[PDB]
Each structure stands twice: as structure tokens, then as C-alpha cells.
Amino acid sequence: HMIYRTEHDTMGEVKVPVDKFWGAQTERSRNNFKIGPEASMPHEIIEAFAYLKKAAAYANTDLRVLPSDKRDMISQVCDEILEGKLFDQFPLVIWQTGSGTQSNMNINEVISNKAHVNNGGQLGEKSEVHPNDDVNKSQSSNDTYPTAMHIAAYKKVVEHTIPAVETLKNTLKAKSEAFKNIVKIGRTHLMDATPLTLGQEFSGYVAQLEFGLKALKNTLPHLAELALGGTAVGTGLNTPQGYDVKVAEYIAKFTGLPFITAENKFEALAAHDAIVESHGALKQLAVSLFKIAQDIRMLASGPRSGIGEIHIPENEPGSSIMPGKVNPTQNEAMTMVCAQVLGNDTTISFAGTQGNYELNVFKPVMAYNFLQSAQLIADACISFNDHCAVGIEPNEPRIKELVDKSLMLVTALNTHIGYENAAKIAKTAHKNGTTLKEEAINLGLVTAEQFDEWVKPEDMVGS
Amino acid sequence: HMIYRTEHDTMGEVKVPVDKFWGAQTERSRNNFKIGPEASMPHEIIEAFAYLKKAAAYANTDLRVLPSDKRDMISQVCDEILEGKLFDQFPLVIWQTGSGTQSNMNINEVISNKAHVNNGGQLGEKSEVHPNDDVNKSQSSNDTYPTAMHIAAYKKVVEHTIPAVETLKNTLKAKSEAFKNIVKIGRTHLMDATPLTLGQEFSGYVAQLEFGLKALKNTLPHLAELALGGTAVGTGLNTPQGYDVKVAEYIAKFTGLPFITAENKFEALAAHDAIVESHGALKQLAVSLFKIAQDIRMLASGPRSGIGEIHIPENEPGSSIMPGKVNPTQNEAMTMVCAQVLGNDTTISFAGTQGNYELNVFKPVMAYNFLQSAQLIADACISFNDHCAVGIEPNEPRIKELVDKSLMLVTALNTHIGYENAAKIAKTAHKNGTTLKEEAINLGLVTAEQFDEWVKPEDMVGSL
Amino acid sequence: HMIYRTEHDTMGEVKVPVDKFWGAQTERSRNNFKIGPEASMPHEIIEAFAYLKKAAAYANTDLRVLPSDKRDMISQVCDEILEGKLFDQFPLVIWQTGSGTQSNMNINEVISNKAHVNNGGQLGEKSEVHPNDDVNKSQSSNDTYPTAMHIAAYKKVVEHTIPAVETLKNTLKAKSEAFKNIVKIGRTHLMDATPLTLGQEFSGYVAQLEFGLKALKNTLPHLAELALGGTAVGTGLNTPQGYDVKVAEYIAKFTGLPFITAENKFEALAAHDAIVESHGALKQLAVSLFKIAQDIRMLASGPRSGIGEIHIPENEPGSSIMPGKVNPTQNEAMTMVCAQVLGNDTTISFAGTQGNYELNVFKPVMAYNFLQSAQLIADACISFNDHCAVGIEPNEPRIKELVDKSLMLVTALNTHIGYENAAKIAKTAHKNGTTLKEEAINLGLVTAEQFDEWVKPEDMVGS
């Protein structure tokens, strides 16, 4: 069934699927890089290329190096890509050249061929829009791919990751306020400790997410800087005067995000330290999220022979062999995502060290890892919020049982009956399996009413 | 346009797309874990589940707890899955429950419903093969997902990763032999050193891959052990006597690989140390491959601004105004894959620490990272071999130019004038921009005839 | 020779070296944690404990829970520790409890016993200053160790790491300015590329360090927050009202650094996300420094059969067997330090995920890794600056040779003689081993004088 057209270059003929909008160079690149599943370059990178190619055409026309009719042809195809209509025209993998050259050429060819069809021609004829001379005007593969990487990274963080974390933080803050008067037993070293409120414990999670949000936002100004206009080595050779600033202005306009031209194009090509910087903040959030998810599943564990202090939503059967068992599966998905982010940080950091001279040629692996972390954190925070956090409720009788049976409240008695008598009560309760109150009364040291007045858990959760 | 049928599990009713062969539990997971791209659980895991479900049915029939007609129904659908016909029936993500329960239930439901249709029934009616009582007989998610992970991991390593590395090693060995008489300049600390042959340098790469292959093969016996038969917590509750050994024998038969039952089912459920062990060896290979690929692009650097001791193939047309351009495409793809494997090792090691009590619930992320490393190493080694290594050739004039002018050829004068005198010659040439021979004569330390007789790079590539 | 005194607790007698100022609890802790070399807890942590113990005594006296005479006794020993006089009194390892409990008790015992000697008593007699009741008043091991960790971390970064990076950045900036007119050949993919100046290449390194400095400084406000006053679980039980704010004020005064009380004490005890945040910025600097050091040793490689574009200081013989060889050993030390920092980041991130409930009990390993990275980056930047960067000089003849022999300048001819003639010149030069100028002249396409006018490398390093 597969029908081909025949294209030609200095390697000879090359068959291209007859209906596909890529060209000879993209087709050869499929075979040169058969590494992992086809088409693995992230769609967000292709979308970002559409933004920057449109902006380059607009800047080039303003600066009188590209005719406006060709700008319009290019821009129309870019809009189609941005609308999600052409993803099946991008068959190339992440694991291509480290400059992402083949993906740059893939969008140049697709824009060229689709423009020809939009102009009324037949796919496979020579286009009015030349892939290199027109679509790639004033550009290099070297400066286009890192621009796409930053556009995609910034957009994912600001439009997906941050909103998702913010929503989860808001839920945990509302829960913290709802739980502010529920006194529970602390655990340090996993061992019995002095009291705090369930709201205080949840307030820690809120504060962790607030700090992670601040830290991630701190990284945005460096990520906003774009390499476009540095061309092959950073000097801007082959760009019209002012192109750097103008093309960044168009990118900022079309994306609605505050992109600027990079202050130092050599730094922008030879390294991807902004990706290292921003990914470190994603990893900081993953570190906090792991701990939050871990605590919540421990607090919900049981329902009889674990901790059992909270209830969480029960969304699906947990087991076919153990009937009625339900597991904290949203917490599990979150902790697995966090494990992924920590390893993505290893990869990004390694790749970030490995630039040589004028160019870091690890760009696709850095982009792929960054976008994966940003996306998975966003998606897991949405899922965990909607399917776990919004439904957390206290098990007030279990919490109260733990408080009443604890030996750790005994020090409330020291100022009233002295250290030695307090210790005698705790030692007797421990030996007998009884409560502090039972032994305070039955040793004749404190009346029931005086004990209730002196040992108030709600008075033990502040200075 | 979406039409649903109504199904149920022990928790309630669930609307399931009318034409899909999964059931209530798969549909819940599909909707409850919208995390990353759709349907991301690796197809290798689904295929491995098909092998183990077929084996479990065969073992259950032999041990007289499942009728053979139901075995045949189950086995038929497993065959369809293995033939690649039913991947649209597996919509679940990696980022699900950490035991992989939901993918276990996905295959149980698909086998049950497709068997009913194969039997002449209507999709949605009660099946002759119950998903839990028949397809999951003698099993838990807790022992099935680890079993699928090991089957998939072992098969990827033995059928893909090892053959690809072996082929690349063979090419580098043939190149080493072809280059055994070409004397080049060593570089240590990036600085000019003493001679070695290009074949000797390439023989190092060969040895590195041979050691990595041995180290990876050393990890196979632990990876061959299967959890299947441990059921919920490791005790084998609800298995027929002898099921653990028999089901492993059927898995070994159907896969053609030497799987055995795990000696300790608690170790097999509560941790995935075999994945840590085997991935460490994949990472060892990636460390060596990075260095090999890095050296080859450095040796090829050019045409004029660098080293230029070797030529590498061109895989793209190039341009007429850029003659002699060098495009180290495969070196870049390989080094990026290696960077990926390093971080996959961090993830696997982290997840491997995190088992609690009777179960590690990081199983899908461990399986996904392992399979990715094994696949990308295999594919990158094939591509690097075919599009780079087989075509490496020496630039003999450039090699000779760079060896003949190394100042550290003065090491050859150590035996005649002492290491201190030789240092003064090399230090003087470096300061004056002159040659070794001219300064040795200027210093009155060596004559011209003595210099030509004593300084021969071809005599410096072996022992005394 | 070893003479002991005999102390006593409920485990029985314990021999303590007769002249040492620690007590029974520290002595037992030596044996309980024989893990790695003795005394490995960083001296900076001990110094930080001295600051916080002095501040706690001052706050406690102001708030009328500790007599001023005992404050003075405690403060005097703290001053001795800060003067570096008592490090031999701290024998405990990093690998103790994860709350650092044993090091807290070690300073409490040393302060107690040294105060007694300062008061005119004999070491081994009962002290006027009780280790727990006085030196540990209003405190827990749980809130003291993380306070010491932040004090030590912040001080190391601001007093050592940042100044060292700043100095190196300044040197590289001066070199960039000095080299601004030296045109050299770019390298992308390790392969010949279009020109840039040596000053432009060095300006990339400067920009990388400037961004890393900004990123590290962004992490300081979270690191300035101190846990002290949270006590065992975060509630501040057993502190006088206002102690949290007052003790942070004293710490800020005594250290001269802008410490504040943590806004959320649960976040401050249950996690060490500020250490993750700040270490990610140290790792970002290490990623940049690796690339900078790698480029510099590649550019200096040879001196005959490598790159050879720069000279670096030659500080020592590189080899005994190869006479006169000198190696870029400062670059090697730097790259090894950077490798260390990347693994320290793995450890800190792992430990940061592992808090449970009210307390993260991975505090010493996080503190040790953080201080090691901050110290090694500082020391390597000083050494690399003084013994390499200040002495970098261009090899102008070698740089010029590479420019004159490059095929990459041929595109300067396109607008003057056309693509086809330019390509003919490049193809002929490549085939013959000659220069572009030689073939332009000898093909009769360009005169020598016209070639020099049209192909000016200094005009090819901007837009």
C-alpha cells in the first residue's frame, strides 16, 4: 500500500512517503537515527520551532531581507503547526545530532512543502518557499534548537507545572486550616514524640511547596533569555542589524511570555546552564512532593494494623487476591514521578558539563528530560490533588486514642508534682500497659479533675 | 459519539467504551492516572504478561486446578497479544499504582473478554474465562508484575543489547587489527606524549566493551529468577504444590530463555535488586561507550582546526561550499544516550531503596527506566556501528605529521643522555619554537647522526 | 600512658580521657558510632553550634529563664570554641544519629566542663553549669543541629564560595577584555566553524559565572531561616514567649549574617529543602566551572600536536618518564572537584526526600556534603585563579595560522563573486591542501588585494 515520491540529492534518489510534507533530508534522517521509538522528539519542541520560525520570518521582513509574501506563507504553516494539525509530519527521534539539526531541517521542509500546497501546488513539486534560503533565513541549527528548548521549557513551567503545584498547595493550605484544632502525637525518628496539631503538620507541606514555587520562579529570568540571533557560533554573523532584539520581541508577542534576547550569545550556545538551574528547582519540588506523598500514605496506612490517623479517597480495588483492600495509589504515582525527576536531574547535570568550545551538543537530551520532569510534575500534582488531597479527612477517634495513650505528655506534670513523681507515673504506665491518667489517679498522685486541668494537649502545641 | 457499556467491580459500576476489550478496573485506571502520554506502559511489559499468563494457565492445568479448555482459551489470547494484535486494548500508563496491579488486571480483563468473543459470544456478556478466578488463578499482582519486568528485561538484554554491543566490539576489533602498524602520538592530560599504534589505541576500546559484556552477563543469573508463585506477600498462599517450579519451567519454554523460580520470594517482592544489579552493568557499558564515542570525534576533529587523525563516514549530502566538513552525528547520538543511562541509574537506585515491608511499590518506574536503557544502548550501538565505526579510516599523512613533531619523542634520548638533559632539550624547543633535533645540536648534547639513529617512533611502541 | 577519669551513668562506669572536656555521653557515642575516621563531624558545624549556644544563653537570660552569671560562663566557652582553641574536644563522626544528637550533647558537655575549669574548679568535678538544664535550656537536639547546619552553610557560601567565584569571574572578564580583538576559529561539534574573538569566547565563561552567582544568591533567603525555637516537633513547646525571634537576632548579631527565624518550624525540621535549593546552585556553578576548565585545557593542549591557541602557567613537572612535559594540573583539580559536587548533589537530593513525619533524620550527611561542595568550590576557584587563569595568554601566531588556513571564511566571498565561484575556491583549496587566498588568486578569480579587502576576519565577528 505504501506509495512514495522520489526526491533527489547528492546521495542519489530517496523515496519519501507520497503524502508526507517532510522532504529528502528528514527522510534520510529517519534511517540515520533509528534509536528508540519513532517520532520521539517532544511535540512541545516542534510547537516551539513553529513560534520561532514565524517570529524569524516577521523579523526578517521588517528588516527587509525576506519579502512579506513569503513571510505570510511561512507564518500560515506555523499557525497550522501551533493548532496541532501537523504532528504526523515530524518523525524524528530525540537521539539525533546534539544540535537538533535534523529537527530544524524537518520544520523547514514541512513549512516549505505545506506552503506550496497552500499556494495551490501539488506536494512534491518545487516550492515557492525554499527550506534553507527562506525558512532558515538569518538562522543556524545551532541557535534555533536552544531557542525552541527555552520556549518549550518556559511555557511548560508557567502554563502547566506552576499552576498545578499552586492548586495542590492551596488544597493543602485549606486542609491545614480545617485541621488547626486537631491535636495529634508527633513522630520523630519514627518514634513517639510530643504533640502538634494535624493542621501544623500539614502547614509544613504548604510551606515546602511555597518555597519550591519561589525557587522555581527565581529561575525564570535566565530561562527567558533566547539564543536566537547568535547563529553558528554566537557572533550573529548573517543576521541583519537588530534582528536579535526584534525576533525576541516577536517570540514574546506570539507566545504571550516575557522572552528576551540572551545578553551573551556564547553562554547561550556553549552551555545550557538555564536548563540546569530551572531543573534544579523542579527537582527541589520533587524532593518536597516525595516527602509529602510519603507522609500522607503513612498517615493513612492500615486500616487496622498501621497508623490510621487520616482517611484518603478510595478510588479503585487494590488487589484481586485480597478482597476489599484499597491502596494509596495516587501517592504511589507521585513518588514514582519524583524518583524519575531525580534521575532526570543527573542526566541534565551531566549533559550540562559537556559543552565544548562554541557549542553544547547535548541539546535534545536536555530538552527531553526537562520537559518530561515539568510535565510529569504538573500531571501528578493535578491527579494527586483531585484524587487524594481534596478528600483527606481526619480519623478523629484514632488520633485521640493515640494522644490519650501516649507516654509523651507526662512532662506537663513536672511543674505541678515534680520530675520524680511525673517519672513514677510514666514508668508505672509503661510497665502496666495503662495510661498516664490511670496511673496518676491510682498512685494517689493526681485527681482525675486536676489531671485534666494540668494535662491539656491543646495547650502543648505552642510556646 | 462515545458509547459505553456498564460494568462493575467490587467497588461499584463503571462505564466502559463499548468496543474495548478491557473492563471496569482498566477503565478506572485509565481515567484516574492521567499522567504523561497515554498508554505509556511499555509494550515489552504487556508481551511479558502474555508469556506469564500463558505459563500460569499451563501450570494450573497440569496441577489440576484449571480445565484444559480454559487453558486453551487463555493461551489463544496470549498468542494474539504476542503477535502484536491487541495493543489498542492496553491504555494504561507507567505512572499508575506502584505494584503494577492495574496492568495485571488489564491483561486479565482483555484475555477474559477476547476469549468470550473468540468463543462466539458478545463483548460485554459474562465470559467463560473469569478474569480473576481463571486468568489470575494462583496469582497476585505482587508476583506477576515483577515476573513481567524480569521477562522483559532479560529478553531485551539477551536478544538486543548484548548482540548490538558484541557486533560493535567486533568492528572495533577488526579496525584495531587493520591499524596495528600505524604509529601515532599518544596524548595524556591532552598533552603530547610518546607513540602508540592506532591499533593499540583501538584495542583499548575493544577491551572496554569485552569487560562490560562480561559484567552484564554476570548479572543474568539474578535476573533469571522469577517472583511468580510468591503471591500476595511471598508465602505462596493460594498456589498448588509445585506451582512455582512448574510455572517457571513453562515461562522458560515459551520464551526460550533460562528463567528459574526465585529462591526467596520475599526478596523477589520487597525489592528489585536484580534490576539495580543489571542496570549497573548497562551503566558500566554506557560509561565506556561515552569515552569511546568521545575519543572518536576528537580524533576526527577537523578538517583543519583540530586533530584530524581519522576520517569518519558522512551520512548526509553536505554542501558544495563546505568541502571536507566532518559531521560526528553518531558520536552525538551515542553520547546523549549514555547521558540518559547515567540518570536512569540514579532513578533505579533511588526506587530500589524504597521498598517497605513485603512489597516494593516502585515497580513500573524501575521497569520503564531499565527497558529504556537496554533499548537505547542496543539501538545506538547498531547505529554507531553501521553509520560510523565500520567506516573509520586513518589519515596516515596527518598521523605521521603529528607524531614526528612531538617533543616527547625526546624520551627516546633518556637512555643516552639522561632524563635531565632530555628535559633541557624539550624545554628549549618549546621556549624557542624550534625542533628537538636543532636544540639538541645547539646544546651540544647530541649530534645530527646520533639523533637520527636514536630517535625512531616505530621502535617506541613496545617493551625494551 | 593513657590516664582516665571515671564517670558514671545508668550504663555503669565509663572511662573518659582524664584531660578531655567531653563527658560520659560523648565517650559512649565514640564507641556507638565507630564509622569512618574519628572526629569527622565538620569543624564548621562545631563553630556554628558555638554561635547558637551563645545566642540561646543570651536569649534565655533576656527572657529571665537563665541567670546572667551562667550565660557568661557559657558564652566564654563558646568564644573559646569560635577562636579555634577546642577542636580536639569533638571526637564524634558524621555518621551518628540523623538528628546530630550526639554532637549537640558533645558541645553541651564541653561547655559545662570547660566552664567549671574556667570558674576555678578541677576537670572531672561537678560543674556549676549543667549540660542539659543550662546549656541546652529551651532547646532540643532536633532544632539545634539544623540551626548549626544553616549557620555553617550560609557562612561558607557568603564568606568563601561567593568571593572565590567572584574573583575568578573578574580575572576571566579582564582576560576577555584583553583578548577582544584577537580573532580565532570557532569549533562546533569539535569541528571547524566560523570565527569569533578569543575575548568573545572568554566572555561566555564570564556570563556563566555571573548567572551561577545570581542563582546561588537567590537561594540565600531560604537558607537564612533558622529552625531554632521549634524544639522537638516544631511547636516551640518549652521555649519562653518570643525566644524564636530573639535567639535569631542574637545569632545574626554574633555571626554578622542576616539570619531570621524560620516562618514555618515544621518545614524547618521535617525537611532540608533549603540545603537542596542552595546545593543545586552550587552544582550549577560546578557544571559551568567544569566546562570552563575543560575548554581552557583543550585550548592549551599540545604544545605541538594539539590545539595550542593559548599558553597557561606551567607550575610543576608533569612527568618523570617524559622529560619537560607540563600538564594543565589546575584544570584537572577543578574538574575533579566538579565531579565530586555532582555526586554530592545526588546524596543531598536523596536524603532530602527521606524525612518522615516531624523530623528529617539525615541531617549530618546533608550538612557534610553541602559544606564539602561549598569549600572545595571555593578552594578550587582560588587555586585555579591564582595558578592558571591570571596567567592565560594567547598564542597569537598559532591562532592566526588557524584562521588563515581555515576553509570556513570562504562565505565572505559570496556577495562579491557568487556562491559557485566561492565553492570552487573552497573545493580546490581542500583538494590541494592550500589556503582560500592561494586558490582565489591562482584560479584567477580574485586578486590578492581584493581578497584582503573582502575577507577580513575582524569583520566576521558580528551582525
Next chain:
Amino acid sequence: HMIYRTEHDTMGEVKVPVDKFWGAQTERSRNNFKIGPEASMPHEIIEAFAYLKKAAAYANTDLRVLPSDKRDMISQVCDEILEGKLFDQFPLVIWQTGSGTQSNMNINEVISNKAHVNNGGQLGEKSEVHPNDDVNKSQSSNDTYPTAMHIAAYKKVVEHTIPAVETLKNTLKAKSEAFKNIVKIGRTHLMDATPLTLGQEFSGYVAQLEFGLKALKNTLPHLAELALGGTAVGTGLNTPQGYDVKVAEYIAKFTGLPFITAENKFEALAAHDAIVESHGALKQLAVSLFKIAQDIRMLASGPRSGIGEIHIPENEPGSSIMPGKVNPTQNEAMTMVCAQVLGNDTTISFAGTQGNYELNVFKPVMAYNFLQSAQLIADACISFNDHCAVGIEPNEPRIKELVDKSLMLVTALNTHIGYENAAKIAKTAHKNGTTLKEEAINLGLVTAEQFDEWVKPEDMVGSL
């Protein structure tokens, strides 16, 4: 107060502290690499250099290139170093040249000068044993430092790490046997599951350590290969015929460990893949040890707010007002050590990728991280064994309380009433806060006598 003598190398004159036995090159390094704490190069590396310098002298004398009287002078100082008498003569840091050249020169200079004093001369005079011509005869830094790294690494693993892990494994095995009849509740996903014995749970830990020991031992043959004899670039230039084999034999004799000469000297200089390989196995052990230590503190959590199924020893006095306090001191030390090993693996893997051409110049950082992991695992396993594992005891009343309460004991009714009816019972008790038996009677699904006869935890810890 500081008095110096004047020395020189091929680069110029150097002032050396008058009473120190090092020379000009050590003094340059001491002053040029003020990075981290003073004198940080591991003493195990210095000791390993003493073994290899003694072996080189013995091999050189046998092969007729060094007189036996000079061999004896060198060997005597090597013995003094091995006895621990000269560590004050080694002031250099890890963070020096990446080949470790400066530490090689440090031992050459110290041997030379101490031999002269041993011969009756004055420190600072010309020695009978030349540091380069005699002590470094047939050697380079490029082959000596990797040799020292392997000697030190292998000795630490076999003489410290393996014995410590083996002892801990034996203790856990004895505990598993002692606990084989104590039925406890399994936990999966942290949730109450079906029973297993406490001995079964501990047997998982034993199996994990056994696999880690096997994996570590599998890495020993690569680690046994020594670079010595490759000299500057791997060719063996300037070695006598047969020196590589003979010097390895002397190293094996003097250390008592089964070292051999490396099969490929280029692989042995340009990469440290054996360190990557062996460290991955140390990291595998650390991954298992983390999980074991984590479980033990979770099982001990208490006295009243947690699980409390086991007792662990107390190692500190405690306080009268805090009876029953549990202090999981060794679990914290162990888990922190394990966190350290994970990051050491990142560093070693990164450095292992970074060799260029004939030499990897990340040798000291690789050696330092490897030795730290091997040492800390050994010490932590000794401490954890002696101060925690040997004293673990069951809390049998608490264990029984927690198993009798598990709703997943309802799994035992599956064979009688079906998985769906059993689910309703457990779901009802969970909703109502009642017991399984009470709801099963209320639902009319099981009688009281049938429940007592059918539900027995002790019958659920094996197969059908």
C-alpha cells in the same frame, strides 16, 4: 621558626622544610593545591604505593636492571611505610593532578631520602637511591597510580567490606531461624495484608545480602588486573621483558591477594571501568542495606504511636521520665551511609566517562570515593550488627494483636464464599469499624463456628 633546605627539579629550585623527607616535587604540589583539608590523599593509597614500589624493586632486580643492594634500601622504606611510621611525610591532597603523579613522586622522594638516612647520610644530601632512576625505574605515574588504586580498593573490599557484610548476613540468618514460627501481618503498599512469619520477612533481608555479596565478588576479577607495566601510554616502553607479569606476581605475594597483570594496558590507563563495575556492586549493597535498616526502624516504631512488632537494643542511658523510648541510632547511621554511597556512585560514573585518549585524569577522585564507600559500608555493617541486629527481639503480644486485627485475613474465606462475598465483609467492617467475624455473621455469609474453623493465620504462611 620554619627552616628550609634548597632542592631542585627540572623546573627550578624549591625550598623544602628542612626536617621533611619529601623533595622538590612534593613541596610544589603541597603549595600549589591548597584544596580541601591538608594531606587528604587516602593512607590506603600511600600503603598501596609502598607495596607496588617494593614489588617493582624486586622485579627490577630479578630482571637484572636494579642492583639488589638498592632493592633492599627501597624495600626497607616501603616496610616502614606499611608499618605506619611515615604518614607525616605525605602532605598531598586528593585534588591534585588528575593522574596522581604528585603522590607517585611523593613516595619516590620519601623512599630516596629516608633510604639515604637509613644508610647513614644526612637528609638533604644526594641519595644512594635516585627517586626517578631507581625508585621509579621501569614505571610511570600513569601506571603506578591506577595500580595503587586497585590494590587499595581490592584490599578494602576483601579484608573489610565483605567480612562485615557476611557477619551481618549471618546474624540476620540466625534471627530468621529463631523467628520462623512467629506469625505476623504482612504489609503491602503500607496497608494490612495477609500473614507471613517474622522469620520469612527476615529471610528476605538475608537473601538480599547474599545476592549483593555474589554481585560484588563477580567484580573482583576485573579489579584484580593491574596497570603496572603499561608505563606512559600503555605500550610498556622502558620496561624489561617480562616485567609486567613479574611485578604483578610480587604484588600478589606481598599483599597476599590474587592480583594479575592487566590484559590490555590501554584499557587500564584510559579508563577505570573496574572501579565503576565494583562500585556499582557496593551501591547495590547500599540499596539493600537501606531497605533493611528502614524496615527494622519501622518495625520497631514505638513504644505506642507506631508498629512496635520488634524491640531493638538501647545503646545510651536514656532518662527516667522517658520509659520505653526507642532510639534507632544504628538505623540512622546506616541509612545516611547508604545515601552517601548513592552519590559516590554518581561521582565515580561521571569521572569514569571522562578519560581522553591514552589517560583518564580523574584517578584520585575515583579512588577516594571508592575507598570511602567500601570503608563506610564495612564500618556501618559492623556497628549495625553489634549495636542493633544481634539484639533484635520480637514483641509477640503486639505481633499477635496486629495479625488478629487484619481485615485481609478475609482472604481465607475466598475458597468458601468467593472473592466478591469476602470483599463485602471486609468492606462492611471497614465502614462500620467492626470485626470481620461480626459482619460475616450480620451479612448471613458465615456462621460463628465456620469463621473460627476457617480463619487461622498460622495456616496462611505457605502453599495449598
